[PDB]
């Protein structure tokens, strides 16, 4: 109409559950449908922004208002709406009531938005990071942003000033220029402070585990995954439950979440499996456990292929151990009865890899 | 008197028909050769010697001794002037219409071997001799004792060797020590005279006692897997068998005698076997199961390795099964043989197939 729908939304109940949370799913789509039509007019854009369920005067108290737009960018929605959303939050956070709460939990989504292909979106997330950075020079949605939990390992003060001032703000311009430059920049940052790399690292990783946005997981992972270790803690040591969650869900379940965000299941499989580092005993065990349990085939494939890629940098003795398991796996009575593809995939690992003298003696002696 | 004492001592020695490229006439050859190396520097002593009655000019070709002596001297660890002297003595001895009735083709291997010589003087002297041999069967069953030229060249095949490959690349081979082997390879790579030349060359390589000539000729023969249905392996296998038969003593000794290296031989002998040769690879496995010199062992396995990528699809499986079979052999395991270790080195170095791996697992 579009005011008839605007009035339908007028009589709507404000809430505190975030949009990045389970309970508010049915609400979000409804609002989001309207936003996709309202965002073409600055007039209707304000109409929408203003209806009381969004609760502009309740962000930062509420965690609803910002969460809605976070989710609208980083979502399978056309460019002008991702821009519009980034702007609604950009201008809304300059208002003054907002200089007492922290809002660090937005940076994952800005970081994500800077990997976006649309030039206008990268510039919009750039501007938004600038405003977020001017702020300090406590925590918004600290435990409610995804419903049950929020920002799991918060960012330290020195780590925050290092995130903004050392890694985030200096790379904005080239990040607007090169759709790829963000992952490169963020990796080259966490590989400027010694313990700030660690706190930024943990912070990013936790948000990657906890969001429902597969898209955010991927974009953050394009960079986060290409970091083997930082001061005694491996990225696997931080992200392994992401792998256990993703592996556990059915083919339906994965196809369905992926469809909802219009992302490709294989890309997720690859990204999830890339969480495990070479000489990580527990990550390897998780791999072997997960393949013994019934799982999506593309995931099975992705896991074994990862074991292969991991093989060259596997140390000598864990190489032997991985061959022992692969062998025993070929020899397992239950999988043999199933004639599962686990056998064939395992033998393919044993082909494609460069074996060692010791492994060969294992093969000979039984 | 330059050499009168020695020449009178050689006078009293009785000529024989057992050839120099044969077994028994060893100390005799050594003796004659020692004197020759000193006699070859003076034309006076060269002629005194050439004439000595035990050499038995002009009884060659009645007697296979005279020509075999100088043959053995080109292809020996002897100074340049002595090899040239021998090449010249045979050229001169053979332009003499005394010999226009016998066929001296059994000399061509030794010329070919001689044109690979580094010293240019030797190369051109062998050039002279190839041309003189070209203007025109000697020792056919005698040159090496029990056998001679085991597979000879027909009329068309011999004229093909002379006019087609030898004499046209002759001058460039005198300039370049390399152009000989190259010329012969690019020659066997006419038909099917190629095959008769091939058999002929190989027969002399198997049969000669001159490891140096075996090598020099193999530098070429080994560069040819097959031509018109016959594998070089099928022709050279008894060489491999003989050579594997030798003790470390005998190989080091024979090698010393000609001043060639046991390893270079190990290499050339083993490359005799082409990849997809059932009987040759089978021979390898038999030989390694028997006692052999380690250098040969290393070389045999090293060869199986190199041969692997060209092993046919199924033959990879069968031979990997065989290698495995060796590693599990209890008698060798008690010996803690180096065969086991070299086999596992093969099974490591090689790209396996799913079928081979399943063989390993179901083991």
Author numbering:
A (entry chain B): 17 to 153, 160 to 213, 228 to 402
B (entry chain A): 16 to 151, 161 to 213, 229 to 402
Mind quoting what the paper says about this structure?
The 5' region of pre-rRNA that consists of the 5' external transcribed spacer (5' ETS), 18S rRNA and the internal transcribed spacer 1 (ITS1) is co-transcriptionally packed into a terminal ball of ~40 nm in size. These particles represent the earliest assembly intermediates of 40S and are known as the 90S pre-ribosome or the SSU processome. Within 90S, the pre-rRNA is cleaved at sites A0 and A1 in the 5' ETS and site A2 in the ITS1, yielding a 20S pre-rRNA intermediate. The fully assembled 90S contains an unprocessed pre-18S rRNA, U3 snoRNA, approximately 51 assembly factors and 18 r-proteins with a molecular mass of 5.0 megadaltons.
The EM densities were docked with the available crystal structures of yeast 40S ribosome and AFs or homology models of AFs. Utp10 is a large protein (1769 residues) with mostly α-helices by prediction. In the EM map, the M domain is continued by an elongated density that should correspond to the C-terminal region (C domain) of Utp10. In addition, the UTPA protein Utp10 adopts an extended superhelical structure pointing upwards, forming the large arch. The WD domain of Utp5 contacts the WD domain of Utp4 and the M domain of Utp10. The exposed H1 lies over the tandem WD domains of Utp17 and contacts the CTD of Utp9 by its base and the M domain of Utp10 by its tip.
